[PDB]
Amino acid sequence: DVLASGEKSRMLFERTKELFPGGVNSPVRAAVKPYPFYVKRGEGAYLYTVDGARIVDLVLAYGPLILGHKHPRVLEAVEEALARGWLYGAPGEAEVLLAEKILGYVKRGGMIRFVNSGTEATMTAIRLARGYTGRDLILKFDGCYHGSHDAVLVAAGGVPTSAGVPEAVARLTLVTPYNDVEALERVFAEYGDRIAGVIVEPVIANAGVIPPRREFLAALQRLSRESGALLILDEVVTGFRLGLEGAQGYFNIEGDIIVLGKIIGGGFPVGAVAGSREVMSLLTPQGKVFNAGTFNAHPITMAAGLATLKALEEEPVYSVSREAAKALEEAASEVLDRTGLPYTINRVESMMQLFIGVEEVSNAAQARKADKKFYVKLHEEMLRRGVFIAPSNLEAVFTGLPHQGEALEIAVEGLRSSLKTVLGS
Amino acid sequence: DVLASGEKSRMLFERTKELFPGGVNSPVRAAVKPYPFYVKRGEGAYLYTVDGARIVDLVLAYGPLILGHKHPRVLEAVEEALARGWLYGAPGEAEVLLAEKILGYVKRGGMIRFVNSGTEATMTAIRLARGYTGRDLILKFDGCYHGSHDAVLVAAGGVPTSAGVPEAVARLTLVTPYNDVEALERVFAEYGDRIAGVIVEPVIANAGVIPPRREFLAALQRLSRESGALLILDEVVTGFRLGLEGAQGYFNIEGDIIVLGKIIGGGFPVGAVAGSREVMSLLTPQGKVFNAGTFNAHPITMAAGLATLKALEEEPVYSVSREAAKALEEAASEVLDRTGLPYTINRVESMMQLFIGVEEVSNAAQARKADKKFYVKLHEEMLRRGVFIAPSNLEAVFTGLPHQGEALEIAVEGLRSSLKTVLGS
Ligand SMILES: Cc1ncc(COP(=O)(O)O)c(CN)c1O
Numbered sequence: 001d002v003l004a005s006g007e008k009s010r011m012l013f014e015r016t017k018e019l020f021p022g023g024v025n026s027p028v029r030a031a032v033k034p035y036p037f038y039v040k041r042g043e044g045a046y047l048y049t050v051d052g053a054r055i056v057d058l059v060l061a062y063g064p065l066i067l068g069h070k071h072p073r074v075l076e077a078v079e080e081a082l083a084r085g086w087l088y089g090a091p092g093e094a095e096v097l098l099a100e101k102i103l104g105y106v107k108r109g110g111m112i113r114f115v116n117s118g119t120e121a122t123m124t125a126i127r128l129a130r131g132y133t134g135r136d137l138i139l140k141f142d143g144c145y146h147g148s149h150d151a152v153l154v155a156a157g158g159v160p161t162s163a164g165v166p167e168a169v170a171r172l173t174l175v176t177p178y179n180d181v182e183a184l185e186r187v188f189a190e191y192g193d194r195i196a197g198v199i200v201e202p203v204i205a206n207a208g209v210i211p212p213r214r215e216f217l218a219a220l221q222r223l224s225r226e227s228g229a230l231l232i233l234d235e236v237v238t239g240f241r242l243g244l245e246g247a248q249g250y251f252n253i254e255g256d257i258i259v260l261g262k263i264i265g266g267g268f269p270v271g272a273v274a275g276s277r278e279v280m281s282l283l284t285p286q287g288k289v290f291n292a293g294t295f296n297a298h299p300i301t302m303a304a305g306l307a308t309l310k311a312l313e314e315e316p317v318y319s320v321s322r323e324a325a326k327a328l329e330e331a332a333s334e335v336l337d338r339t340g341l342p343y344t345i346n347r348v349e350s351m352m353q354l355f356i357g358v359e360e361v362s363n364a365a366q367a368r369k370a371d372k373k374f375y376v377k378l379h380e381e382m383l384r385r386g387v388f389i390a391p392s393n394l395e396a397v398f399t400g401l402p403h404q405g406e407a408l409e410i411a412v413e414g415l416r417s418s419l420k421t422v423l424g425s
Numbered sequence: 426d427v428l429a430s431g432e433k434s435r436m437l438f439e440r441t442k443e444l445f446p447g448g449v450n451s452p453v454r455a456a457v458k459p460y461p462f463y464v465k466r467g468e469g470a471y472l473y474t475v476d477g478a479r480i481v482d483l484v485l486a487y488g489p490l491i492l493g494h495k496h497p498r499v500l501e502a503v504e505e506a507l508a509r510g511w512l513y514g515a516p517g518e519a520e521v522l523l524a525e526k527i528l529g530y531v532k533r534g535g536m537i538r539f540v541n542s543g544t545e546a547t548m549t550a551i552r553l554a555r556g557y558t559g560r561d562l563i564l565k566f567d568g569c570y571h572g573s574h575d576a577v578l579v580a581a582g583g584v585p586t587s588a589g590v591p592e593a594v595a596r597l598t599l600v601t602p603y604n605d606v607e608a609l610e611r612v613f614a615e616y617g618d619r620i621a622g623v624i625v626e627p628v629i630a631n632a633g634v635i636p637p638r639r640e641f642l643a644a645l646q647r648l649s650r651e652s653g654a655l656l657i658l659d660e661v662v663t664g665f666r667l668g669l670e671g672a673q674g675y676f677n678i679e680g681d682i683i684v685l686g687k688i689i690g691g692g693f694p695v696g697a698v699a700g701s702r703e704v705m706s707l708l709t710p711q712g713k714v715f716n717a718g719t720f721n722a723h724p725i726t727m728a729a730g731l732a733t734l735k736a737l738e739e740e741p742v743y744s745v746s747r748e749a750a751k752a753l754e755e756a757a758s759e760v761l762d763r764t765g766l767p768y769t770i771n772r773v774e775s776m777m778q779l780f781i782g783v784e785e786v787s788n789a790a791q792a793r794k795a796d797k798k799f800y801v802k803l804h805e806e807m808l809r810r811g812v813f814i815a816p817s818n819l820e821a822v823f824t825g826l827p828h829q830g831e832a833l834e835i836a837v838e839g840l841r842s843s844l845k846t847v848l849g850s
């Protein structure tokens with residue numbers, strides 16, 4: 001009953017094929033079925049296509065929009081900051097207030113460095129772990145996504161998963177299965193003091209959603225501590241979504257370097273690296289680890305981020321978002337439970353994902369066994385119901401403050417009905 | 426007669442020492458004398474400190490603000506775009522119009538990919554040159570700045586100029602002197618078909634300002650063409666500053682991959698890579714060279730960039746900016762010419778820099794011979810005159826549209842008077 005990609009979108013779609021590689025500026029955007037819809041504007045829980053169709057947004061730009069689109073509070077803060085100019089080339093005030101608030105939640109007494117993307121952030125964290133330890137090796141886990149830079153575009157043979165990445169760079173990155181304590185202990189017994197740092201997502205969000213095993217978390221902290229390797233918690237997604245204290249507070253764990261992003265920018269380009277004074281002091285202009293950026297601590301990003309965190313402390317964002325995701329899971333379960341089809345749903349607060357054909361998903365290997373065809377059809381049916389979920393089973397479904405009342409009702413009805421349609425396909 | 430860093434700035438300065446490494450979020454910001462001033466807001470040609478002092482901005486965030494601060498046209502475009510939401514997670518309309526306009530000026534019939542910083546942009550261009558050719562080596566020039574990523578944090582022994590950068594990565598980058606035809610031809614005769622690409626700034630902006638020799642430019646195009654290596658013109662600064670067609674149109678040259686940034690974002694986080702369909706088609710989701718980004722083609726950046734380019738085509742920005750820089754050069758020359766002090770001033774349109782103690786600066790080595798102490802004192806005196814120039818002699822002085830009338834008068838008077846003071850110091 002809804003046509004997300006209409007004739008206006010069709011025109012733009014054929015038109016951008018000549019302007020951008022693959023027709024888009026980011027891979028995941030091209031997978032939308034039957035073809036990408038173009039957005040005219042966004043507000044609250046909705047995206048509005050150039051043709052006019054209104055769509056409930058369960059993607060939220062893949063994490064940043066926990067407050068929904070064009071949040072009134074953040075909008076007003078940004079409007080006010082805008083009247084003061086948006087770029088200075090020197091220190092501003094908002095960056096100071098945001099740093100203090102962020103550090104108060106993720107690394108009290110530590111320091112922070114603001115960058116412009118999660119990619120720049122994890123890239124900076126890695127260079128920092130190498131500079132601090134004097135080691136080269138970085139350990140990452142299969143299924144974890146850390147951005148668009150050489151060091152993390154690697155898989156176990158360490159070989160490049162993208163072209164243009166020298167074999168020499170790829171060899172310096174190790175890879176083992178997520179949640180695999182056995183393998184984790186083995187790789188450390190195999191490389192020991194040559195490992196500079198261990199980067200990991202406390203909760204995987206780029207291979208569907210996958211919660212961590214308590215033993216995996218404990219092993220990570222213990223092994224990095226005993227070997228001298230820095231534990232890098234990539235909280236670009238988990239930061240400020242799993243509560244104000246993020247993954248560290250949620251799972252009661254500690255990281256040496258905390259990578260932040262998306263939510264802390266209020267919807268504007270952002271990335272950040274936080275750590276103790278001992279580690280952070282290595283960054284230029286204080287130490288030898290280089291990091292610079294024309295847009296670092298961009299005034300508008302700072303202002304939007306501060307307002308966003310302010311809203312997270314004053315509004316029932318976490319409860320509302322948790323309830324929305326819970327309601328979606330219950331709706332999907334109510335329909336699927338009336339079948340003989342195996343499946344599983346992983347959910348951590350406001351982030352979740354459905355996996356068809358398997359009863360358990362505790363790692364990327366299992367996540368990859370899920371029925372892709374079923375999911376893709378589900379994605380398409382949902383759009384036809386006016387609901388937008390990631391076009392890929394390996395992405396995640398995110399809920400936010402606006403997912404309540406009518407918007408939630410539409411999403412829930414859409415999910416029930418889309419499942420039934422796909423089930424009877 | 427002006428105190429840029431007052432008591433409000435002093436408080437913030439001591440306060441941020443505990444929040445950020447070196448007290449700032451980007452190295453160059455810490456060099457401001459006697460210590461960094463904090464900005465409350467910016468408008469037109471001015472920056473306003475938290476204490477209140479108004480300062481003429483000859484830094485302009487180091488390039489992006491060719492239209493000055495809070496340009497009315499760009500402001501209104503951004504306000505309107507803001508009301509439509511600032512982040513979608515799917516394609517928007519502004520990105521399409523900006524891509525078409527940019528490509529029409531720098532690579533007709535080609536493609537483009539929007540990223541979030543110049544660093545991400547040059548990093549993407551390099552990975553693209555390596556993926557396209559299947560080669561590893563990248564040639565850069567001494568004094569050129571390409572961002573905060575491993576591959577370009579290198580110098581000739583290729584060794585790392587920053588900590589945390591593996592020797593293996595650094596060895597894959599070659600470095601020779603800027604404008605040195607002899608050395609350029611030699612390195613190609615030494616590495617030949619192993620070179621994936623040659624990255625260079627058509628006009629150096631991060632070792633003072635240094636124009637290119639016509640022979641250097643010709644050799645670059647010829648050698649890359651004959652060896653199969655891609656010529657990567659880093660126009661993050663030159664793009665849209667040296668005319669709408671940038672360096673290519675200004676010097677009548679051609680690059681395989683054009684790196685863009687700063688101005689194309691209208692003051693918001695941005696970066697871009699442009700090239701022919703043959704090369705660009707390698708980027709994901711079309712090809713194997715990976716590049717993704719949550720904020721790629723950010724709606725506000727797109728809207729601000731489009732409005733900015735629109736202003737560049739409709740307003741006398743280039744003539745006004747050229748005249749301002751010319752007036753500053755004449756004022757500095759009028760004072761210095763009445764002395765027996767050797768010096769030289771390099772200027773290309775709206776970008777320039779003064780070099781004391783040397784009669785010529787055609788490369789970074791010479792630029793490094795300039796009197797740093799004189800410059801630093803000049804920087805401080807200027808601030809005391811209410812004018813802001815880079816605190817480092819290796820940075821550049823940029824002029825923009827607002828540099829006219831009273832603002833220009835203040836800058837010119839400040840320069841004359843600051844020179845005299847330093848000369849009599
Ligand atoms: C030529 C060039 N390339 C890359 C960069 C880095 O741009 P960004 O700081 O946005 O990463 C700069 C900024 N100094 C630059 O001038």
Ligand SMILES: Cc1ncc(COP(=O)(O)O)c(CN)c1O
Binds near residue numbers: 119120206
């Ligand atoms: C955990 C994680 N790290 C890094 C990134 C990349 O962030 P960005 O796209 O802004 O570079 C993402 C975004 N998918 C992420 O989820």
Ligand SMILES: [Cl-]
Binds near residue numbers: 267510
């Ligand atoms: Cl929005």
Ligand SMILES: [Cl-]
Binds near residue numbers: 495
């Ligand atoms: Cl501004």
